[PDB]
Ligand binder design. Sequence first.
Ligand SMILES: NC(=O)c1ccc[n+]([C@@H]2O[C@H](COP(=O)([O-])OP(=O)(O)OC[C@H]3O[C@@H](n4cnc5c(N)ncnc54)[C@H](O)[C@@H]3O)[C@@H](O)[C@H]2O)c1
Length: 120
Amino acid sequence: VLVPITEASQLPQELIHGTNLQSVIKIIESGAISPMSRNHVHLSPGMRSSSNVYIFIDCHSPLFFQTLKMFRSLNNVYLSSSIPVELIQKVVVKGNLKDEEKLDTLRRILHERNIPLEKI
Ligand SMILES: NC(=O)c1ccc[n+]([C@@H]2O[C@H](COP(=O)([O-])OP(=O)(O)OC[C@H]3O[C@@H](n4cnc5c(N)ncnc54)[C@H](O)[C@@H]3O)[C@@H](O)[C@H]2O)c1
């Protein structure tokens, strides 16, 4: 069962969507993190073990609850409506030597949208 999240005071300190480098490029280019198979986008308070990309949602955006409908399951996982990339606070990628070309792409699209990228 899910309960509603309607006030910023209920948002954790960070809200993270774990993914890989190929999805985060598709995410930025299509303009939104979409629920896909599931009915909601799954977010971890701050994931698949193979997730090397971490998308931080800006929990302090004045437009947060005008853009997302937010829920929380009893085991503390946050479920949301489509998240526009413009609500993305920061994208953190664990670098792999094999993905150096994709990261240059990610660097450009994120700058074009003024989303900061951090490579660890
Ligand atoms: N992703 C997280 O950080 C997170 C948070 C908490 C728990 N979980 C757990 O993980 C499972 C959910 O799987 P999931 O979160 O990987 O999602 P999912 O299994 O439904 O797979 C959807 C995939 O599509 C990607 N995607 C989203 N928007 C896209 C777009 N516009 N273009 C291309 N790709 C896009 C997502 O990043 C994700 O990799 C559940 O068991 C859930 O409890 C996930």
